[PDB]
Paper text:
The 26S proteasome unfolds and degrades hundreds of proteins to maintain proteostasis, regulate cellular processes and generate peptides with second messenger functions. It consists of a 20S core particle (CP) capped by one or two 19S regulatory particles (RPs) that gate access to the CP proteolytic chamber. The redox-active thioredoxin (TRX)-like protein [name] is expressed in many cell types and was proposed as a nearly stoichiometric component of the human 26S proteasome. It uses its C-terminal PITH (proteasome-interacting TRX) domain for binding, while potentially reducing disulfide bonds with its N-terminal TRX domain but how it binds and is regulated remained unclear.
We initially focus on the most abundant and highest-resolution (~3 Å) state, PSRpt5. In PSRpt5, all five subunits from Rtp5 at the top to Rpt3 at the bottom of the staircase are substrate engaged through their pore 1 loop, while Rpt4 is the nonengaged seam subunit and at low resolution, likely because of continuous motion from the bottom to the top position. Extra density above Rpn11 could be unambiguously assigned to the PITH domain of [name], which forms predominantly ionic contacts with Rpn2 and Rpn10’s VWA (von Willebrand factor type A) domain, explaining its salt sensitivity. The C-terminal tail of [name] draped over Rpn11’s hydrophobic catalytic groove and the insert-1 (Ins-1) loop, which has important roles in binding the C terminus of ubiquitin and regulating access to the deubiquitination active site. [name] interacts with the catalytic groove of Rpn11 through its hydrophobic tail residues F278 and M275. Interestingly, the C terminus of this tail reaches into Rpn11’s active site and uses a conserved terminal histidine to coordinate the catalytic Zn2+. The specific conformation and interactions of [name]’s C-terminal tail are compatible only with the closed state of Ins-1, whereas the ubiquitin-bound state would lead to steric clashes and the open state would be unable to form the necessary contacts. [name]’s tail may, thus, bind the catalytic groove of Rpn11 only on substrate-processing proteasomes when no deubiquitination is occurring. At the top of the staircase, [name], Rpt1 and Rpt2 are ATP bound, whereas Rpt6, Rpt3 and Rpt4 at the bottom have ADP in their active sites.
Residue numbers in the entry:
A (entry chain K): 5 to 127, 134 to 241
B (entry chain M): 5 to 244
C (entry chain I): 4 to 251
D (entry chain J): 2 to 240
E (entry chain A): 338 to 385
F (entry chain h): 1 to 206
G (entry chain F): 353 to 439
H (entry chain G): 6 to 244
Write the structure that this text describes.
Amino acid sequence: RSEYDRGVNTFSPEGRLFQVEYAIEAIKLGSTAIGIQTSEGVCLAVEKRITSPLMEPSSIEKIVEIDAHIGCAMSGLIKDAKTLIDKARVETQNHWFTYNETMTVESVTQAVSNLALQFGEEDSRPFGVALLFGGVDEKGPQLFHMDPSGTFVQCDARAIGSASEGAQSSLQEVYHKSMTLKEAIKSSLIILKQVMEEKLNATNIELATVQPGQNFHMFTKEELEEVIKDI
Amino acid sequence: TGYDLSASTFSPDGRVFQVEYAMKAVENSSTAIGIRCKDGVVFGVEKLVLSKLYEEGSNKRLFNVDRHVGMAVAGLLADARSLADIAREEASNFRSNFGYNIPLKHLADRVAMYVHAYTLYSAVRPFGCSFMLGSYSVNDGAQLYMIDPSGVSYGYWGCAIGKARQAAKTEIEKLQMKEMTCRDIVKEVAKIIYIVHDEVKDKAFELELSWVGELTNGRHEIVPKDIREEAEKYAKESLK
Amino acid sequence: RYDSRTTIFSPEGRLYQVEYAMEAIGHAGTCLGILANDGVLLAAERRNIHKLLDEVFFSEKIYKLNEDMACSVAGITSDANVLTNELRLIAQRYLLQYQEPIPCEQLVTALCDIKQAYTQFGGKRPFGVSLLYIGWDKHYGFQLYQSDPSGNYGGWKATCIGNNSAAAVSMLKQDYKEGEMTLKSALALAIKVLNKTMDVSKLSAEKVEIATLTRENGKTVIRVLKQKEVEQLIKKHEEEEAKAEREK
Amino acid sequence: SYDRAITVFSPDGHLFQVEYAQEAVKKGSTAVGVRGRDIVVLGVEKKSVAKLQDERTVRKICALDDNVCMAFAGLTADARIVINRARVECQSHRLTVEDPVTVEYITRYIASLKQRYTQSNGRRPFGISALIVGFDFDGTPRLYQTDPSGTYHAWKANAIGRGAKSVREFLEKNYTDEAIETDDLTIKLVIKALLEVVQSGGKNIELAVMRRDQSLKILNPEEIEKYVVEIEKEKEENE
Amino acid sequence: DRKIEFSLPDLEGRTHIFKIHARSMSVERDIRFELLARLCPNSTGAEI
Amino acid sequence: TQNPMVTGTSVLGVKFEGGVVIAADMLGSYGSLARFRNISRIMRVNNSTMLGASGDYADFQYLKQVLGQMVIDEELLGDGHSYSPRAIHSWLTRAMYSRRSKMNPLWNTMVIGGYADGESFLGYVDMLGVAYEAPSLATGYGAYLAQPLLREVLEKQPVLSQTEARDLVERCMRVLYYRDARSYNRFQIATVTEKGVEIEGPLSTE
Amino acid sequence: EFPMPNEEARARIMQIHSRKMNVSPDVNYEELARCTDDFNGAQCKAVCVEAGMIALRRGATELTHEDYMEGILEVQAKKKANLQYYA
Amino acid sequence: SAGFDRHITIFSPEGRLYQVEYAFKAINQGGLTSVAVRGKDCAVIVTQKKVPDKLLDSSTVTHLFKITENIGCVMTGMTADSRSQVQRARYEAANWKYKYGYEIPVDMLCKRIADISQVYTQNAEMRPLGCCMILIGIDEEQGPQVYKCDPAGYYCGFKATAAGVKQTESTSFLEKKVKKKFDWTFEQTVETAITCLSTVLSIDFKPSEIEVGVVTVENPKFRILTEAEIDAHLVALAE
Amino acid sequence: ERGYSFSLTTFSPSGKLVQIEYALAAVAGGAPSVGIKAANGVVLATEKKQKSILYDERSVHKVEPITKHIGLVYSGMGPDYRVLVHRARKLAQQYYLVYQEPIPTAQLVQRVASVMQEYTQSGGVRPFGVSLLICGWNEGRPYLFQSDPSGAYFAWKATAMGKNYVNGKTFLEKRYNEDLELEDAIHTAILTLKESFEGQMTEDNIEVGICNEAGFRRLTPTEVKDYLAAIA
Amino acid sequence: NQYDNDVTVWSPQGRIHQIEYAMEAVKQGSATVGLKSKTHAVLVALKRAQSELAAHQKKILHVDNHIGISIAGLTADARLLCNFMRQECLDSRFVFDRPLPVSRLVSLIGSKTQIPTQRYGRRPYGVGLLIAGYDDMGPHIFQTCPSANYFDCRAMSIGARSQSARTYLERHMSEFMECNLNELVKHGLRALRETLPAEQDLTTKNVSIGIVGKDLEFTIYDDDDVSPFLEGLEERP
C-alpha cells in the first residue's frame, strides 16, 4: 500500500483509491454530529469539543446556515468544510437567482459533491470533511450525508464524526418513522450524552432544527438548557 | 531495469525499451493479415469472442479510416480505436485542405508520425496496437502499409500482425499475390487465417473479412455476407 | 531527509533549503558597512586577485542602484547580478511612478519580497545572495540594511557578511562608538576590521574595495575610493599599529 | 513517509505538512492578545536585538487598516508578505464596499490566502500565526487567531508563539469580567501574562493598545515601565 | 495454507477486549466502555 | 461573408407522394455579369437526402466540403444510422445561426429536401438561419414568382405526381426566365425517392 | 524451466484440484483463471481448498463460483468490504 | 557515475551527458551502414537496403530520402525517428525557401536540424532523435558538399564519411583511400563508395542489397540510381 | 554528499550548486582555447582538430564573429556554442537596433552571461556546457571577457580554457607582458596553444582571430601559415 | 512490481497494470444486469445501503430519453461519465434534433476514457457502464469497462458476484429476443437474484429497473414501482 497510496491518481490492486479512504479517516477525527429526519422536520445535534474557555463558543462552526431552509453539519477538516459550505451557499443563491426558487436539499448536496468530486480531474486532494445537510423542501424534511469521496445518499438519521459507529448503532435502535421533533431531539441528545467524553451541558453542544414553515432554528443558550433538563 | 520505466530514456545499449514493450503487447493479440491482390487489398482478422454474450460484431477490429482506406488494427483495442479516430481526422483534414483523397502512403506516413510522437515523451506511452492500412485506386494501384508502435511504416505485399504472425507469413509467402484477383484471394485469406488458430487455447472466433480494390469500385467496404461464407466454406474445406 | 526542495517543512518547522543558503552565504567574500553620523560606507574583499585578471569595472562587489542608493553583494555571481538588475529596475520604476527617490527601505523590502516568493513557490532555489544596502532618504537619512537569502532584512549600524563574518561583526560591536563616528573614523574602523577579517596580511589596496555615501549640498554623491586613498588609509593603519605596539 | 507532500493524506487522515508548518509558529516570540470592553491589547516580546542593529525595522505588530492591527509569530519573511496582502485586501474591500473592512473579514481573507497556499504542491504554507484584533465592528471589540493551517477563531484572550501554552494557562485562570472592566486593568493583565513567558527587563515587551474609534498606540517603554511598576506594587501589596 | 490477518480490532472488538480485560478489575458500574473504545482509534489488545 | 461576389438564382422544390424534386439554375453571376455558366447548385448529401442553395457559391462550396466530410463520416462508422433530412436541416439551422451570431454569416440561402422512412422533407434555411417546412419552396426570387404559383397547385390539390412536379417547376422556372434578370436557361432537376437520389440536366425553354 | 502457470494452466490446475469436491457445474474456471493473475499452482490449489472450506462455512452442500472467488480473496489474506465510495 | 545516465539534462561527474551518447549508440540498432564520398565534381552516397522478408515492398523500404531537388539525405539508425527528422528537414528547407528565396544550403539545412536536436538535448522534454542525418548537395561557389550532423547536435564538413554499425571501419577505409590524391570522378566516386561498403561489410553486394544516390555539378539534382546503373557500376568496379 | 549532485534547483548542505560545477568540469574537458589582450588589440586562438583527415576543417569554425567588433572562442560543447553564438548575435543586434550603436563588449558579455544564467534556475534545463571567451574593441580599449555556465563574467587579460588550461595559465604570466603588440600577442597565443597542443600545428588545425580596432576577423589559413612558419 | 504506479509505463509482459486495476475497480460495486429483447432494453441493478436507515444508493442513472446506464464502479467516475453522456445527448438533440445513436455515444465514451489510460495526469475511469438505449436499429445494451473497450452485449452483468448473472444470461440468451417487457424484466430479475447470497432476497427496497422500448421512454423504477415486476417471480430453489 505504501507505493500505491501516495496519490488519488493511483489504483490499488483491489482497485481502491487509497487516498479517499484516508480522507474518510480524517473525517473520523472530528467532533460527533448527529442528524435525525422526522416527518415534523430535521434535527442536527453535535459536539462542541471546546478546547479552551477563552475561545469564543460561536467562533467554531459546526452547524451553519447554508440557506434559510437547509442546515449543514461539519465533521472533519475546518478548511475543506468552510470551502464546501461557502460553495453550497453560493450554489443555493445562484439557483434562487436563476430559477427564483429554493434549491432542494438534493440539489444543494449535488452541487457540493460536484466540488467534492474535482479531487484531481484536471479542472489537489480530496476534501476531508463530511457534511450532513438537513432541511425542508418541496418533498418535505430531509437529511443528506456527504463523504470526501463525493458519494451522497439520503439518510433518515445519520451520525458522523468521532463516534460515528456507536452513535449510528444506537440511532438504529432509537429511530422510527413516526417520531416527532421533540422526541427526535431528546433521543439525539441522549445519544450524544452516551457517546460524549464530557458530561453534557449547554456549553458543549449546539442543536439545530429545520421544520416546515419555520426556518433553520439553532437552539440558543437558554433553549439548550430547556431540552437538556429532562434528558 | 531502471532504463525501461519511461519512453524518453534511452537504454545504455541504445534502445527505447517502452517501444519494444508496446511491440510485445501487440504481439500478445490475435492475428490480422492483409494480402494485396493484383487488383486490390484484402484484410482478414481473427476476432475472438471473449464471451458468448457478445453481439457477433462487437468491438470489430476492421475500421474504415476513409472511403478507400481500410485499417486492420490488432492489439490493445482502445489504442486501435484511438488510432482509427486520428486516421479519420487526418484523412478529413487532408481532403478538406487539398480536395482529393489522401494517398494511402501519405496518410500512413502522417499516422505513423503521430504514433511515433507518442514514443518520444515521458508523459505519454507508446500505442499498444499495430495497424495496417489498405486502399485501392486506379491512379496509384493498391497499397498495403503496416505501422507498428515503433512508428516504422513501409509498404507490404502481405503482412500479418498478432500472435501467429510468423505462421501466417509462412503460408502467405506460399501465395501468389502478384497476379491473383481479389475474388479468390478472399478465400485464400480465410483459409490462411483458419490455419493460424490454436482452437484449443482460444475457445472460438468470428472471422471477419474486408477488401478494397477494383471489384469494389475503389471503395473499402465489409466483404458481402454472400461471398464471405464462400470464403468460410473454403476455409472449412481446408482441414486446418 | 527534508531538504529535497524549498517548499518542504522539517518536523521542527525549519526551511532546510533556506538555512542551507544562509549558511552557504559564508563562502562569499567579506563585505561590511559602517554607518557614520555624516554618512555610511561599504568595504569588500576581492577574492580573485590574479595578476592576469584585468580590473575593468572596479565595482565587482559594490553596485550603484539609484542616485541615492548603493548595495554591496555577497553570494552567487549569477544570483547577485539578477538581484542587482532587479534592484535597479525596482528603484527606477518607483522613481517613474512617484517621481522621488525610493526611501531605501522600500527597495530593501521589494527585494526581500522577491526572495521570499522564490523561497516559497516550488521549483525555484533560494537566492543565495546576501547584500548590504546603503543610502539616504528624506525620511530617515543614512541607513544600512542587511538582506539574507530568506528575505529577512534589518536595519544595522555596522555588519559584515561572508568570510569570518562573525569575528568582524563581534569586533565591530566591541569598538563601535554609537553616534560618534565620522566618515574618516568609519573608514579607519573599516580598514582595521578588514585587516584581521581576512588572513592576508598588509591589507593590500588592490585586494580591498571601499565605497562611501556622503550628503553634499543635496546631491548624495556615491564615491568609490581610488587606489591612492586606499593606500593612504592602509599606511595610516600601519602607522597606527606601530604606535600601538610602541607601548610594548 | 507521508510527511513529504502537502496534498498527501496519512493513513490516519493527517495533513502532516500543515502540522509541521505550525511548528514554525511554535518557534516565534510570544504574542498575547486580550480584548476589553473599550480596549484591545496585543502583547509581544522583544528579542533583545543586537547591540549594533536598529530596532525600527523589526516591527512585529503592524496595522492592516486604520483600526485593525495584527501581531504575528513564525518566520518574518512570510509574515511580511501576509501583512502586505492583508493591507491590499483591506484597501480593495474599502474600494468595492465603502464600509471599512471588519476584523472578521480581514481574518477570513488571511485564512483564505493561507489555505490557498496550503492546498497544492509547489506552494509552501505560511508559517505565521496572526492575531488580528480590531474595533472594526463599529462599537464591538474582536480578536482573532489565524493558524498557519488556515483556520481562524474568535478568542477573548489567546497566546501564540513560544510559551503559548503557559500564557494561555495564565490567561484562562485570570481573565474574568472583573479583570478587564477598565483599560488600565486590561493592560495590566496583558503585562502580567507576558511576564511569565518573557523574564527580562524593560524594552522586552512591546504593547499595542487600540481604543474605540482611535488609532494604534504603540506604548513607549516608559508607559510599559509605569505599568510594570504598578504590577510590582500590586505584588508587594499581595505579600 | 491459511494466512490469517490479525488486523487492529474494530470498535466492537475494542469494546469486547475492554470487557474481557476489565472483568476482574473493580470498576464502577457506569463505565462507558464504548467511549474508551472510541478514544483508542488504532490500538491493539495489548494497548487496551 | 459581408459582401457577396458570386451569387445564385432561385432554387425551387415541390414535394410529391413518393419523394421530392428540386431544381436550380447554373448561372454564377458576379454582380450583373454571367461569370460562370456550368456550375452545379444541387448536389446530393446521401442516398436519402439532397440539397441546393443560392447565394455565394464559394460560401455554398464551403458547405459542400463540410457536408461531404460531415456526411462521409456518417457511413465510415458503418453503424447504419444516416443523417435524416431533418437531421441535416437541424444541423444547418444551428450551423448558419451560429455563424451569423459572429457577424460572419454564410450569404447562402439553402434548401434541403429528401425522402426518409416514407415521408418527404422540404426545409429551407435562409442566409441568416430562418427555417420552416413547406410542401413547396423557392429561394430568392422564386418566392416572389414561383412560390405564389405553388400554393395554388397545393391549395386545391396538396398531392402531386412526378410528371406534374416536373412541368410545375418548368412552368415555375420558365416564368423565372421571363421576369428575372439573373436567370439562365440551363437547370438541373433533383428527384429523391425510395430508389435513391438522381440528378439530371440541364434543360431549356421556349 | 517451470513458469508461473498461465491462464489455461491456472484453469487446468483448478479443475484438477477441484475434482474430489462437489462442485457446481456453473463454475466458470476461465474467469477464475483471469481473476487469479500471478498465482502459482500451490496458490491455485489453496484457492480451491479455501473455496471448499468457505462453502462448508455456510452449510452449502455444493460449491459455487462466488465461493471460489471468496477463496481467491482469502488465499492472499485479502478482505473485501462494501466501500462507501465504490457504488 | 552510473546514476547520472537516467536523465538527458543531468551532467555526469566527469562532465558528460550520458543520454546523448546512449542515443548515438542507439543509432546502430538498425544494423545498417551508410557511406558518403565527396568527389571533385560529385557527391555519392550508398546505403544498405536490407529486406529480410519476401512480403515486403522493396520500393517502400528505401532509406534515401530527397529533402529537395538540390539537397539529399540518407537516414541511418532508428527508422521512425529518422523519418520524423527527414520530415522536419523538408519543413526547414521549405521554410528557408519561403522566407529567404534562395535554396537553403545543405550545411545550413542540417545545421538547423542539429540545432533542433541540441535544443532537444538541453531541455529535457523529448528523447533525442536517434538517427544520423547525412546530407549531400551541390552548392554554388563551394562544389559538392556532404554534411553529417547527428543527435547530439554536431555537424561538420566531410570529404567522406559514414554512419551506422560499421562506422569506424568504413571511416578508416576512407582515410586509407582519401589521401592518395587522384581524379575524383563520378564513376570513381561511386566505385570508391561501393568498394568501401563492400570491404567493411565483407559482402558481394548484390544489386538489390544496395541503394545509391548521387548529386553532380553537371546535373545538380538528387538522383537515385536504378538497378541497372548500380549493376553497371558494380561490373565496372569488378574489372 | 552524493544525494544533491543531481538537481540544479536544490542547495547542497555546504551550499554548492553541484550541477554548475559539473558543467564547468565538462567545459574544462573540451578543446583548448587561449586569448591574449594587447595594448593594440586582442588575439583569440583555439585548436581545431578533427578525428580524421575525412573532415572538412573549414566547414565548422570555432572562432565566429558576433558583430563587426566582437569575437567568440569556446572550450567545451560545440552544439551548445552554436546556440550561445546565435543568442549573442541576437543580443548584439537588439542592442544596435534600440541604440543604433555597436554593442560594447561589456554589455554584450553581460547579456550573454544573463542568457547563460537563464538556464541554471529551473529543473529540466541543463546548464550551458561551454565557457565563452569574448574579444572586443570599444572606445579604443581592447577587451577580453569570459562567460561561464554559472553566469559569472570576468575581464581576463589572457587565459586558456579547456584541456590543459593549467599549463596554459602557467605559460601565461611568463611570456605575457602588459605592453605588447598585436603581432607579439599572436605569437604568444600560438605558443600557448602549442604547449597544450598534441601533434603538428597545421594551418587547418589551429584557428585564430585578431580583434583590433579594425574589427574582429578570422585569419585565413594563409596568414596562420605565415605566422606559424615565423614562430616555427 | 515497479511497473505498477502509472498508466504510461509498460510492463515487461506487455500490460498496462493500471488499466487492469481500473477494470478490477468495477467488482467493488453492486451487480448489475442489462439485457435487451427485440423491442425493449431492460437493465436491473442491485442497490446497496450504507446503513440500515440510509436511502439505498442510486445505481441506474438517467442520460436521455433513449439512453440509460447502470454504474458499477467508482461513484466519482460514474457520475462524471453520466454527466458527459448527458452533455453529449443534449448537444446531439440541440444540433441534430435527433436522438444521438447509442452506438455513437458509446464510441464517444470509449474515446474519452482512452485518453486517461494513455497520458499521465488522471487515473482511468474506474466505472463500468451498462448503456441501454433504443434507436433506429433497435435496443442496444453496451458495457464500457474502464479499459476504454466497450462490448455490445445481449445481456451483460458487471459488479461483485456478477458471474452468476452472466451464466444465467448465457443459459437463457435464446428466450431474450422473443420476449415481452414482463418476461424480459423477470429474466433480468432472476439474473440479479442469482448473484445475491442465499440469505438475501430481491426486495422492493434494493432493486432498480430501467427500460427503454419502441414507444416507451427511459423509466427508472424504484421502491413500489418495482413491485408490479417483482411479484410473481419464482421463489429461488
